[PDB]
Paper text:
As part of the secreted C. perfringens CAZyme arsenal, the bacterium possesses an open reading frame coding for a 220-kDa family 31 glycoside hydrolase (locus tag CPF_1301 in strain ATCC 13124) with predicted α-glucosidase activity, which will be hereafter referred to as CpGH31. In addition to the N-terminal glycoside hydrolase family 31 catalytic module, CpGH31 comprises two fibronectin-type III modules, three CBM32s, a putative cohesin module, and a bacterial immunoglobulin-like 2 module. Though the putative CBMs, referred to as CBM32-1, CBM32-2, CBM32-3, themselves are not closely related at the amino acid sequence level, a primary structure comparison indicates that they all belong to CBM family 32, an observation that is supported by their overall similar structures as determined by X-ray crystallography. Each CpGH31 CBM32 structure comprised the β-sandwich topology characteristic of this CBM family with a short α-helix and a calcium ion capping one side of each module.
In contrast, CBM32-2 displayed a clear binding specificity for GalNAc. A structural rationale for the observed GalNAc specificity displayed by CpGH31 CBM32-2 was provided by the X-ray crystal structure of the CBM32-2:GalNAc complex determined to 2.0 Å. The GalNAc was well-ordered in the crystal structure and provided sufficiently clear electron density for modelling the monosaccharide into the binding site of CpGH31 CBM32-2. The side chain of Trp1359 formed the main aromatic-based CH-π interaction between the b-face of GalNAc and the protein surface. Notably, the binding site lacked additional sugar-coordinating aromatic residues, which is an unusual feature among clostridial CBM32s that has only been previously observed in the non-canonical galactose-binding CpGH84A CBM32-1. With respect to the observed GalNAc specificity by CBM32-2, the shallow binding surface accommodated the hydroxyl O4 group of the sugar in the axial position only. As such, the topology of the binding site cannot accommodate gluco-configured ligands such as glucose, GlcNAc, or GlcN. In order to selectively bind GalNAc over other galacto-configured ligands (i.e., galactose and LacNAc), polar residues in the binding site were positioned to form water-mediated hydrogen bonding interactions to the 2-acetamido group in addition to the coordination of the O6 hydroxyl groups of the sugar. Since the hydrogen bonds involving the extended 2-acetamido group of GalNAc and the side chains of Asp1351, Arg1393 and Asn1401 were observed to be water-mediated, the distance between these side chains and the shorter O2 hydroxyl group of galactose or the galactose moiety of LacNAc may be too great to allow for these ligands to adhere to the protein surface.
Numbering used by the authors: 3 to 152
The structure:
């Protein structure tokens, strides 16, 4: 049906008003109001910054069998990937403490990054943004969606 997801991670890395909740608020557009962003850089001497790698933890209140999860990347209006978007990501799944390497996806250029899970069962998934298209202090993600196996 509808699947309750809890997201956690270091909110001190993120831009005000653009926190972890924006990963699961049901907004997949690239608008500022939809996204989770690492702290924006406002001045040339700013020392308060977020840094990659950035780890995002997703938990379900009970194990779920998943078809996939889908990361929605920040895109420009012309369909090209924005400079602040994710470029490289890895993920790990857990079930009863057992750890499962879900692998890394690199050179991301598309509107979505999809981890096909083929009905594997997890109670926790940890997604780590490793690189963006700009620098290690920049990251924008529109949404991350989880699709349950029937
Ligand atoms: C118009 C535009 O793209 N503004 C971006 C902002 O969205 C965010 O990425 C910020 C991070 O420092 O940098 C700006 O360049
Ligand atoms: Ca969103």
């Amino acid at each position: 049906s509808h699947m309750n997801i809890t997201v956690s991670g270091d909110s001190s890395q993120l831009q005000s008003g653009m926190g972890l909740d924006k990963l699961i608020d049901g907004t997949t557009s690239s608008d500022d109001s939809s996204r989770m962003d690492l702290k924006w850089i406002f001045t040339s001497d700013q020392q308060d910054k977020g840094t990659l790698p950035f780890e995002m933890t997703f938990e379900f209140n009970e194990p779920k069998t998943l078809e996939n999860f889908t990361i929605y990347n920040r895109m420009n209006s012309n369909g090209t990937i924005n400079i602040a978007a994710m470029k490289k990501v890895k993920a790990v799944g857990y079930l009863n403490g057992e750890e499962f390497d879900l692998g890394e996806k690199a050179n991301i250029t598309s509107a979505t990054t999809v981890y096909e899970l083929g009905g594997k069962e997890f109670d926790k998934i940890v997604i780590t943004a490793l690189d963006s298209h700009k620098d290690k202090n920049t990251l924008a993600i529109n949404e991350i969606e989880f699709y349950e196996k029937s």
